[PDB]
Design an enzyme around this catalytic site. Sequence first.
Site, PDB file in Angstrom:
ATOM      1  N   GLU A   6       0.797  -1.222   0.000  1.00  0.00           N
ATOM      2  CA  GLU A   6       0.000   0.000   0.000  1.00  0.00           C
ATOM      3  C   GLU A   6       0.834   1.279   0.000  1.00  0.00           C
ATOM      4  O   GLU A   6       0.360   2.336  -0.389  1.00  0.00           O
ATOM      5  CB  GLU A   6      -0.882  -0.007   1.262  1.00  0.00           C
ATOM      6  CG  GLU A   6      -1.821  -1.214   1.319  1.00  0.00           C
ATOM      7  CD  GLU A   6      -2.998  -1.051   0.391  1.00  0.00           C
ATOM      8  OE1 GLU A   6      -3.098   0.165  -0.106  1.00  0.00           O
ATOM      9  OE2 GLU A   6      -3.825  -1.910   0.216  1.00  0.00           O
TER      10      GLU A   6
ATOM     11  N   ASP B  12      -6.517   6.791  -4.538  1.00  0.00           N
ATOM     12  CA  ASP B  12      -6.131   5.403  -4.683  1.00  0.00           C
ATOM     13  C   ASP B  12      -6.219   4.967  -6.155  1.00  0.00           C
ATOM     14  O   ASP B  12      -6.482   5.788  -7.028  1.00  0.00           O
ATOM     15  CB  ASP B  12      -6.821   4.511  -3.621  1.00  0.00           C
ATOM     16  CG  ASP B  12      -8.227   4.039  -3.874  1.00  0.00           C
ATOM     17  OD1 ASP B  12      -8.686   4.295  -5.068  1.00  0.00           O
ATOM     18  OD2 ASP B  12      -8.831   3.382  -3.049  1.00  0.00           O
TER      19      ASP B  12
ATOM     20  N   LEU C   7      -8.645   4.009   3.309  1.00  0.00           N
ATOM     21  CA  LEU C   7      -9.628   4.729   2.519  1.00  0.00           C
ATOM     22  C   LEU C   7     -10.378   5.811   3.328  1.00  0.00           C
ATOM     23  O   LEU C   7     -10.818   5.554   4.449  1.00  0.00           O
ATOM     24  CB  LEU C   7     -10.663   3.744   2.008  1.00  0.00           C
ATOM     25  CG  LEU C   7     -11.887   4.456   1.433  1.00  0.00           C
ATOM     26  CD1 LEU C   7     -11.496   5.220   0.191  1.00  0.00           C
ATOM     27  CD2 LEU C   7     -12.933   3.458   1.032  1.00  0.00           C
TER      28      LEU C   7
ATOM     29  N   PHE D 155      -8.268  -6.618   3.846  1.00  0.00           N
ATOM     30  CA  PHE D 155      -7.916  -5.214   4.120  1.00  0.00           C
ATOM     31  C   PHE D 155      -8.195  -4.404   2.871  1.00  0.00           C
ATOM     32  O   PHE D 155      -8.702  -3.281   2.871  1.00  0.00           O
ATOM     33  CB  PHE D 155      -6.402  -5.107   4.491  1.00  0.00           C
ATOM     34  CG  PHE D 155      -5.864  -3.709   4.780  1.00  0.00           C
ATOM     35  CD1 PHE D 155      -5.412  -2.867   3.765  1.00  0.00           C
ATOM     36  CD2 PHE D 155      -5.654  -3.328   6.107  1.00  0.00           C
ATOM     37  CE1 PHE D 155      -4.938  -1.596   4.108  1.00  0.00           C
ATOM     38  CE2 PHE D 155      -5.076  -2.105   6.451  1.00  0.00           C
ATOM     39  CZ  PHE D 155      -4.747  -1.211   5.427  1.00  0.00           C
TER      40      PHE D 155
ATOM     41  N   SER E   5     -13.242 -19.770  -4.689  1.00  0.00           N
ATOM     42  CA  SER E   5     -11.854 -19.705  -4.233  1.00  0.00           C
ATOM     43  C   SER E   5     -11.796 -20.104  -2.761  1.00  0.00           C
ATOM     44  O   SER E   5     -10.874 -20.779  -2.316  1.00  0.00           O
ATOM     45  CB  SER E   5     -11.317 -18.290  -4.355  1.00  0.00           C
ATOM     46  OG  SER E   5     -11.563 -17.784  -5.651  1.00  0.00           O
TER      47      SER E   5
ATOM     48  N   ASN F 222      -8.298 -19.692  -9.953  1.00  0.00           N
ATOM     49  CA  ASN F 222      -9.597 -19.064  -9.797  1.00  0.00           C
ATOM     50  C   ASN F 222      -9.494 -17.630  -9.294  1.00  0.00           C
ATOM     51  O   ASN F 222     -10.294 -16.790  -9.642  1.00  0.00           O
ATOM     52  CB  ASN F 222     -10.466 -19.848  -8.805  1.00  0.00           C
ATOM     53  CG  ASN F 222     -11.888 -19.310  -8.677  1.00  0.00           C
ATOM     54  OD1 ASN F 222     -12.171 -18.459  -7.834  1.00  0.00           O
ATOM     55  ND2 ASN F 222     -12.764 -19.779  -9.545  1.00  0.00           N
TER      56      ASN F 222
END
Length: 162
Positions: free
Chosen positions: A11, A20, A32, A104, A117, A132
């Site tokens: 990040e 972002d 965020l 996250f 998945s 997948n």
Amino acid sequence: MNIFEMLRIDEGLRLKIYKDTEGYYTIGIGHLLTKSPSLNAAKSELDKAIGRNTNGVITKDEAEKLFNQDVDAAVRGILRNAKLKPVYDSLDAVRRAAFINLVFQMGETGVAGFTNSLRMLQQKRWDEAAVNLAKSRWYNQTPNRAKRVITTLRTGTWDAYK
Ligand SMILES: [Cl-]
Ligand SMILES: [Cl-]
């Protein structure tokens, strides 16, 4: 390597409100702020989150505090969600970090929809789950970060990250 160092790599750190990859107002380490288009809605959210008038800028400490909160919330969300929890419990320590990363980044709600998945992860069918996961908007929008997380999920090592 641990969840904190892993996410800080993926990040980055920014002490100034920024946009972002999706165009959202963010700060620090992937925190965020708002999906709204207004930069004032963003500074308002920020001051609320920090407890002070920031004028869009924060310290390293402040950024790390938000980060600690957010990893904690991520973990607690997984453990509270009936679809996530069993997957997380079933995994080893490296793989758990990667599940956290996935949450996250994309919210409990989103990850919880990765139905197939999830079922493959739980059955420890690594290669298949990697295949997948890659058929997702997620992978197509942020391919290098996605490949690192997927590799961690596939291998169970921190290789993508040395
Ligand atoms: Cl907050
Ligand atoms: Cl990326």
